[PDB]
Amino acid sequence: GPLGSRQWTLEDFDIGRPLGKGKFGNVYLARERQSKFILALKVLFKTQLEKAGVEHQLRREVEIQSHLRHPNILRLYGYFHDATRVYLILEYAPLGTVYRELQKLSRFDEQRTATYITELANALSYCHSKRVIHRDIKPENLLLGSNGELKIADFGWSVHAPSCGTLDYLPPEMIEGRMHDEKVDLWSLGVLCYEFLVGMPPFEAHTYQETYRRISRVEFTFPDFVTEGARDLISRLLKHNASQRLTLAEVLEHPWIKANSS
Ligand SMILES: O=C(Nc1cccc(C(F)(F)F)c1)Nc1ncc(CCNc2ncnc3ccsc23)s1
Numbered sequence: 001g002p003l004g005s006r007q008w009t010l011e012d013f014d015i016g017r018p019l020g021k022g023k024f025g026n027v028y029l030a031r032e033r034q035s036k037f038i039l040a041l042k043v044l045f046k047t048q049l050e051k052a053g054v055e056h057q058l059r060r061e062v063e064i065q066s067h068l069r070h071p072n073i074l075r076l077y078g079y080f081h082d083a084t085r086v087y088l089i090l091e092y093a094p095l096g097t098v099y100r101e102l103q104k105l106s107r108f109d110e111q112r113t114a115t116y117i118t119e120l121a122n123a124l125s126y127c128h129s130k131r132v133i134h135r136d137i138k139p140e141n142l143l144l145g146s147n148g149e150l151k152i153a154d155f156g157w158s159v160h161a162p163s164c165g166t167l168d169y170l171p172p173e174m175i176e177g178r179m180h181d182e183k184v185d186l187w188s189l190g191v192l193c194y195e196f197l198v199g200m201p202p203f204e205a206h207t208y209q210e211t212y213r214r215i216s217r218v219e220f221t222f223p224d225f226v227t228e229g230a231r232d233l234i235s236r237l238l239k240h241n242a243s244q245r246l247t248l249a250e251v252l253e254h255p256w257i258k259a260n261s262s
Pocket of ligand 1: 088092
């Protein structure tokens, strides 16, 4: 492909409409001028990265992504900069974010949910084998390909094991500033499964302090419609003791996953 070749500049691209907004910058549709290749560009600001102390994290993300190749991980082809801005050259996800899909549908059926969980678990299995922990799994970081396949994105917070918004997706060991490993992604997977079926994550609250309290205690309940198989998978992922959480192999072979995934 044309985005694997070169020292990229902004003048190499036609810029299109905004695809999304982020805390650290906007994402735009783009077209590479020579090849006419359609892609996305995320535009970040130097001052903003400097002040937050995250420039090395961005370098690490680009480096991590230079190695990862999986159909359920969104490609990051490389980056360039000008005087004031840094630009990430990204694979375009034509069907948008899972975050937006959930807003539109309110909740997902068991089939769509199990299918997304399967694809996520495959992507994460691959990351963990290449010892990469994602650490930032949530619906805004999950995008959809031409055929509706899930693609994980944003390795800006990723680390090699062991080692911005709400607390909703973070496990007890992370919110308490403790040592943590690959099992953090397993907790976030449980949170996602719940959110997909219910329409909101299990520790959601009006305050950071209440979300913190409920995560620490693993204090949550299921609405009446959540089936016993889904309850089982979620309860075996949302364990305070990280070592007790299901492995990804065990998720992919879970009876509820097997029955409902396409
Ligand atoms: O955002 C990232 N990295 C980061 C972010 C903050 C801070 C840091 C730092 F701390 F500095 F390391 C690093 N990476 C990302 N990688 C992929 C992204 C997805 C961008 N969105 C889209 N992409 C393709 N198609 C569509 C369609 C709709 S939206 C959309 S964001």
